[PDB]
Structures are given as structure tokens and as C-alpha cells.
Design a protein around this ligand. Structure first.
Ligand SMILES: [Mg+2]
Ligand SMILES: [Mg+2]
Ligand SMILES: [Mg+2]
Ligand SMILES: [Mg+2]
Ligand SMILES: [Mg+2]
Ligand SMILES: [Mg+2]
Ligand SMILES: [Mg+2]
Ligand SMILES: [Mg+2]
Ligand SMILES: [Mg+2]
Ligand SMILES: [Mg+2]
Ligand SMILES: [Mg+2]
Ligand SMILES: [Mg+2]
Ligand SMILES: [Mg+2]
Ligand SMILES: [Mg+2]
Lengths: 127, 226, 62, 42, 25, 97
RNA sequence: GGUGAAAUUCUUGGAUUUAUUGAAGACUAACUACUGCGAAAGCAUUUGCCAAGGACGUUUUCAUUAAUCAAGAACGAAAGUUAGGGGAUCGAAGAUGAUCAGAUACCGUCGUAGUCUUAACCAUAAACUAUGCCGACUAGGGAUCGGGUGGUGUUUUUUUAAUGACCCACUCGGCACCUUACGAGAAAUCAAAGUCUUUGGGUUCUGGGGGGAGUAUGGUCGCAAGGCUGAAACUUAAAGGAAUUG
């Protein structure tokens, strides 16, 4: 009875991506990030811009036919910060109020088998 | 950040969802649920041939959804589209995986992680890479707090596991392997054959990935659906 | 113009560097028994009733 | 801690389903705890 | 001065004196 | 003088330790000297559990977790309200609170 | 995208994001610890081969073959050099954006040499335990790694054997640790930094106020960069160690 998509929240710092693809992932619906809802360039990763983006993905999912969704939270990963940004819990919360149905929350952060090299030098990011 | 794009075009509106229409996904018969979900493609025009557009899609689904029971909650399964027939496309097995929370829950410190992999080919000339995991366990009555293995126990355990996995594959075509992985029966005789060496808890084996496939042989897939 | 009324049930403490903003948790009259945390500019007491232009908010310390 | 976890879902109160639509709804997902005989006679 | 950069400064000075003396020889 | 007996670290019979990078600034710090921590939180913030319980399609769903191991350098740990500074008699206390 | 905030940069030629593949090179996460091996530098994916090693066990053998060592020899992080290969990341130089009074810095984005390997050099390091090696004795406590001994001890196999994995006691060797100070020390502190004016177990190396100076010169090694050896004139009354109170 429920049509299931995949939420795919890229919860980084400096931005937050929400877009609901199909079950296969080849066909994508409703990609609105956090940067298109606030005019600061600083709070593109804020909880406000994340929840305003997550309200838009559910409006474009309801008018298409998506009723439920699977959630794959994501940090930057690789050699980078590997922890979720501030907008991850805001975007996940916002599309639960909007009418969508949640199943199978999961992280898909790219964790290496200690890949190439972090940037910043051996002395660090000196600030 | 709308008013930040200096230029939108280097050189200098039709809604596609009305064009789009829905299909449905069919799991193989070695799964208690056939209805997985629905997919979207564009309309089958005379020059793009929508059946070939959705031909090689890979669908991510959980085994708990495929079997109903929540005991196989981690256990992710790859399903690969192969054969489409009137909004009723069929899928075959493409691989199995663990969830990242289940893998990271198992890996704790003050215990020894043991990993084994094989590259054994099945009867249908399917070449599969099967991974195994195990953890040494603190026995009951044990006082000391770490319970490590002795690096020749590990090499004895790894040899036992790799010979078991390469034995259960030759003899299973593909559907026997899928009906062996679902009951988690593979984890049983790993535990039985390794209880001589070390206690070895947590043998939920690991992912298995496909490497190469033979020709189509569409009678085999309609045996999985029909 | 949707507005939402909430009732302060437990005062958490002051926030802001100069101390002018108070952390409170509030109980909504409509849609009873679901509670969030907000920030108050002025003097807020127990059983004060707040009106909010939006209720989709958690409070983080300033 | 590693061992602790929480459970979310429909079962985060049991009630009598007077409406047959509620009965048809409750049997559909599968939350029916018991079907008891009524106390009085027919 | 840092003892590393006095060591660097005299190493550069020795290179100048080594090559201003090779003019004669 | 010698501030610590182990001098910063846990290197006794090791020669070399093959360092790691700090999660905050990518500073190369030896693994024995690192201030390793484990951050284990739910997949869902605690203010959204009742929110997600009523929006889930499943009757019984076990909420998964994030298990991320953090390595800090000495400068970043002291700055980020971690092990920052102890008195000379409390420096020898090795027990976590 | 990045940031405290931005900008350089990429984007309607579809950037960022999603899916499916493929290729390349580096690395060997989580397990991973007051844990292991090695003379040190060092060494963490699987399996096969090659040769080596310590501890233990021994009612096996030789019989003083020993300890430390001028001269001399081998190995020796990283960086650097030469010549092929490789060249994904990161990134001395360089280029740019920002900040700034300046910013040829910190910060951002690119980016050569390098980072990897093969053959040959170099011979350095806060190469640190800032603590030479061999031998003996001197206070208590538990843990742990490897080997061994004992115990009708627990569990599993085939209730049951042998084993294995644990438990208790003991022992040899190892990485360490906790308490105390008989003892030492200027103190910090130290089971060695103790057995040192009640001054002798054996032996090697090194220092003699601070600069000038690891400079000049001369040898010698090195393709080079440089390494090893290494003064004097002159100047100076304090430099310096560990603790105390501000
Ligand atoms: Mg100091
Ligand atoms: Mg060293
Ligand atoms: Mg694209
Ligand atoms: Mg590994
Ligand atoms: Mg070990
Ligand atoms: Mg030296
Ligand atoms: Mg020295
Ligand atoms: Mg002695
Ligand atoms: Mg023993
Ligand atoms: Mg011992
Ligand atoms: Mg040891
Ligand atoms: Mg003198
Ligand atoms: Mg002198
Ligand atoms: Mg002083």
C-alpha cells in the first residue's frame, strides 16, 4: 500500500542535501539542498535550511506518488570529517512530520580501510 | 544562496513525471516476499527502448523485508534486474551485505577479530567472493578481561573457515546458497568446527559479492519466477 | 497567518552571553502532550503562555 | 554503551474496536491481541 | 635566534665561502 | 624537568608507533599519544524518537546507532573541553570518571 | 564548494547529488592495549616458500672457549642525490583569494620536485629511557606476554577420552606498573639515579665557567648537499639546574 523511496540525506558541514530516489536509485525525485532556502552562505548547513529543504522533498514526493521512504544518513566520509552535520537530524525529523513514512534508517558514510592521506600537513590546520 | 550564481550559462519547462510511469519489482522465489517496490522510467519511445533503460538496475533491499521476520534485520540483499515483462520486471540475486551498525556493534575491543575470504566458483560458473567474520569470546568462569587468540589459533581458524566456505559453494548452484544463507545455517558448522580451537562468538558470516556471470539462460530466471 | 499557543511548564535557565535570553520548555495547548524547547527574550514565569509563528524549533544555547 | 539500544514503532494502549472499519484496519497490519467471548448471553 | 636557523645561516655562509675561494684555486 | 613518567604516551618497548591524524585539524600524532574516544549515539536524536515511533511503518523497529572512534591531538583535546589540565597530584590519576 | 566571515574555483555546454561499471597508484582502518617481536632505525591484510631468533624443557654434549673493547667492520627514520619505472592522493617551490598598517605568513583553492618502487649513494635525528655493557646483593603488591609443572577444579567434543579454552597454586624469562623510602639526590625525583668520605666487582666512552664556535684552517669520506676530525686571537662575571612566594 506504501510506495517506498530512499531519502539519502547528505548531512555535511557547509551544506545539507536531501533527495528521494527510487528503490533502484537510478531515478531521482526532489533534490533540494539547504543552500537554496537561506540567503547567508554561512548557514547552508543549519537545522532551519535542512528542515525547509526536507519539507520541500515531501511536497514533491506526495504530488508524485511517494508515500514512504527509507533513510540513508551520510557524513562526508573518506578522509574527511566522518561525522554528521547539524542538518541531519533536522532533515530526518522534518520529513517525518510532513506525512511521509519512515523505515530502515541507516548510515552510508564512506569509511575507508585507511585510504590515501588527509589534507593539512603533518603539523595540522594551524588556527 | 540564490543570488550568488554569476552566470548560469557558459555559452550565453516540461514536467517529466507526467512522462514517467511505474513498474514493479519481483524478488526470486527463494524469498518469502515477491513484492519489493516500484520504479520509475520514462515512456517507451521508438528510439530509446525503455526496457533496456531499466534492464540493468540494482535494487537495495533488506532481508527482513524479504522474509517478514525482524531477526534478519541487518543482512542487506542486492537484487539485479534481468528480464522485464509488462510492468512486471524480474530480478535475480546480485549480492549480500551487512548494515554498518551491525558490523560496528560486533567489533569491540579486548577480543580478537578474525576475517576470512574465499573466491570459489559455484556450479553455474558463478564466481563469488564470500567473506567470514568471527570474534573470540570470554568464556564463563573466566577471570581475566581480554581473551585474545594466539595467532596460530587464528591461522587454524582461518584455514577451517576457508575450507568450509569453499566446500559449501561447490555443490550449491546459486539458489541452494541463497537458501543456505537465509537460515544462517553457515554460521553453525563454523562454530562446531572451531570450538576445538577457540570459543569464537559472533559468526554472522559477512557480505558475499558477485564477480563474474555466465550467459543469460533465461530458463533459469523463469524457474525463479514461474 | 497560522499561530500556535504554547504554555511554559519548566524553566531551564538563562542563556546568551549577556544573560538576556531564557531557555524554557513549553507545552502546546492544541496537540497536547508534545513538548519542545524554545528561547524567550523577556521575563518568563511558570504558567506563561507563548505564541509562536512556527513550532518547528529546537533551542540551542547562544 | 555498546549493548544498550532503544525500540521505536507502533508499540512505543489496547482498546476495544467498536467500528468494523477499525476491526478491518487492525487485522490488516496485524495488531489484534485477543478475541474474547462476551460476558452476557445472546 | 633559533639554533636551527643559526645552523642554516652558517651553512649558507660556508657555501658562499667555499665558492668564493674556488675562484682562486 | 620531566613532567611525566611515560612522557606523553604509551611507548615502552615499541621503538615506533606509526601515527594517526587528528579528527579536528589533521595533525599527525602518534597513536599511543592520542586521546582516543568512542562516540556512540543513536541514529536519531532523542527529541525525535517519539516523533519517529509514530511515523514508522514497522511495529517493532530497533533504532540503529552510530559508532565512531575519535582521535584528538593534545592541542585540540584541551581546546575542546576534554582532558584539558589537571593538578600535579591529579596528573597521576589514570582512572576515568 | 570552502570559511570565524568571505573570495578565488566549477556550474542550464547540467556543477554538487544518485545509480551502474572500469582503470590507476598509495595505504593496511575498526580489532589496537601502560600488549608482542627486533641490535637499533623499525615492524600491523591473506597464503606459499626461504633462512634466522629468543624464552622455556633437558639426569644431552664441549669444556673456560669469557666481559668490555683503541684500530677496523655491518645496519642505520625522514629529508636529500643519480639512473629507469610509476606518478591516485597529499604537497618544500611556485601561482592565486582573503585577513592585515604590511603578510611573498597563519587561513582557502590549485599546484611542480617529492611522497611509491628498482639499482646505487648519503651516515644524520629531542637516532630519548636525554639514563653504556657484563656480574652480585637489597622492600612489599597484583596484573599481563611466552614456556613449563601440579591440581579427582569448570566447559565442550563422542554424557564420557586425548586435546583445546578457561580456574587455582608454583616456577623461569619479558614489557611495565602500584605503594613505601631502609638508601640516594641540589631538588624534581629514583628498586635504581641504592649497596658511594664506613670512598676499590670488571670494563669502554665522554665533560671541566659563558661566549667566540662546532667558526677558521689542514686532512679525510661523499656526485653533491654535507659527514668525521677540529683550534686560536678576542671578550666576559656571571650563564645555567631544581624548587619557593608573588
Ligand atoms: Mg615547562
Ligand atoms: Mg625513535
Ligand atoms: Mg549530474
Ligand atoms: Mg587490517
Ligand atoms: Mg599481539
Ligand atoms: Mg648526533
Ligand atoms: Mg645522546
Ligand atoms: Mg646491576
Ligand atoms: Mg605463566
Ligand atoms: Mg612473570
Ligand atoms: Mg615483553
Ligand atoms: Mg674547569
Ligand atoms: Mg668550555
Ligand atoms: Mg626553572
Amino acid at each position: 500500500s506504501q510506495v517506498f523511496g530512499v531519502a539519502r540525506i547528505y548531512a555535511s558541514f557547509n551544506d545539507t542535501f536531501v533527495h528521494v530516489t527510487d528503490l533502484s536509485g537510478k531515478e531521482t525525485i526532489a533534490r533540494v539542498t539547504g543552500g537554496m532556502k537561506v540567503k547567508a552562505d554561512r548557514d547552508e548547513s543549519s537545522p532551519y535550511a535542512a528542515m525547509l529543504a526536507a519539507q520541500d522533498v515531501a511536497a514533491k514526493c506526495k504530488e508524485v506518488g511517494i508515500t514512504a521512504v527509507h533513510v540513508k544518513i551520510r557524513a562526508t566520509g573518506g578522509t574527511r570529517t566522518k561525522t554528521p552535520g547539524p542538518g541531519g537530524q533536522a532533515a530526518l525529523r522534518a520529513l517525518a512530520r510532513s506525512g511521509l513514512r519512515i523505515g530502515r534508517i541507516e548510515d552510508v558514510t564512506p569509511v575507508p580501510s585507511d585510504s590515501t592521506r588527509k589534507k593539512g600537513g603533518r603539523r595540522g590546520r594551524r588556527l | 544562496a540564490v543570488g550568488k550564481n554569476k552566470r548560469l550559462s557558459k555559452g550565453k519547462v516540461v514536467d517529466p513525471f507526467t512522462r514517467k510511469e511505474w513498474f514493479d519489482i519481483k524478488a526470486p522465489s527463494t524469498f518469502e516476499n515477491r513484492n519489493v517496490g516500484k520504479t520509475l522510467v520514462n515512456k517507451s519511445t521508438g528510439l530509446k527502448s525503455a526496457s533496456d533503460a531499466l534492464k540493468g538496475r540494482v535494487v537495495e533491499v533488506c532481508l527482513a523485508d524479504l522474509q517478514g521476520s525482524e531477526d534478519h534485520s541487518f543482512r542487506k540483499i542486492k537484487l539485479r534486474v534481468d528480464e522485464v515483462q509488462g510492468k512486471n520486471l524480474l530480478t535475480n540475486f546480485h549480492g549480500m551485505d551487512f548494515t554498518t551498525d551491525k558490523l560496528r556493534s560486533m567489533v569491540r575491543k579486548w577480543q580478537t577479530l578474525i576475517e576470512a575470504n574465499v573466491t570459489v566458483k559455484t556450479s553455474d560458473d558463478y564466481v563469488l567472493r564470500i567473506f567470514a567474520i568471527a570474534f573470540t569470546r570470554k568464556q564463563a568462569n573466566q577471570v581475566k578481561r581480554h581473551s585474545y587468540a594466539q595467532s596460530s589459533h587464528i591461522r587454524a581458524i582461518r584455514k577451517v573457515i576457508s575450507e568450509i566456505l569453499t566446500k559449501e559453494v561447490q555443490g550449491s548452484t546459486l539458489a541452494q546458497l541463497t537458501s543456505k544463507l537465509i537460515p544462517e545455517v553457515i554460521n553453525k558448522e563454523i562454530e562446531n568446527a572451531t570450538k576445538d580451537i577457540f570459543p569464537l562468538q559472533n559468526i554472522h558470516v559477512r557480505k558475499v559479492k558477485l564477480l563474474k556471470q555466465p550467459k543469460f539462460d533465461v530458463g533459469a530466471l523463469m524457474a525463479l519466477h514461474g | 497567518t497560522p499561530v500556535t499557543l504554547a504554555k511554559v511548564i519548566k524553566v531551564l535557565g538563562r542563556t546568551g552571553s549577556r544573560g538576556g535570553v531564557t531557555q524554557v520548555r513549553v507545552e502546546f495547548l492544541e496537540d497536547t502532550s508534545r513538548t519542545i524547547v524554545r528561547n524567550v527574550k523577556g521575563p518568563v514565569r511558570e504558567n506563561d503562555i507563548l505564541v509562536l509563528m512556527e513550532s518547528e524549533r529546537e533551542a540551542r544555547r547562544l | 554503551d555498546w549493548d544498550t539500544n532503544t525500540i521505536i514503532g507502533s508499540r512505543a494502549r489496547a482498546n476495544v474496536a467498536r467500528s468494523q472499519g477499525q476491526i478491518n484496519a487492525a487485522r490488516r497490519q496485524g495488531l489484534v491481541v485477543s478475541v474474547d467471548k462476551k460476558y452476557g448471553s445472546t | 635566534m633559533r639554533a636551527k636557523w643559526r645552523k642554516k645561516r652558517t651553512r649558507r655562509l660556508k657555501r658562499k665561502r667555499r665558492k668564493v675561494r674556488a675562484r682562486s684555486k | 624537568p620531566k613532567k611525566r613518567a611515560s612522557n606523553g604516551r604509551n611507548k615502552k618497548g615499541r621503538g615506533h608507533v606509526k601515527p594517526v591524524r587528528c579528527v579536528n585539524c589533521s595533525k599527525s600524532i602518534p597513536k599511543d599519544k592520542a586521546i582516543k574516544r568512542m562516540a556512540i549515539r543513536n541514529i536519531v536524536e532523542a527529541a525525535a524518537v517519539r516523533d519517529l515511533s509514530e511515523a514508522s511503518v514497522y511495529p517493532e523497529y530497533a533504532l540503529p546507532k552510530t559508532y565512531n572512534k575519535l582521535h584528538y591531538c593534545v592541542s585540540c583535546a584541551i581546546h575542546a573541553r576534554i582532558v584539558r589540565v589537571r593538578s600535579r597530584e591529579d596528573r597521576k590519576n589514570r582512572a576515568p570518571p
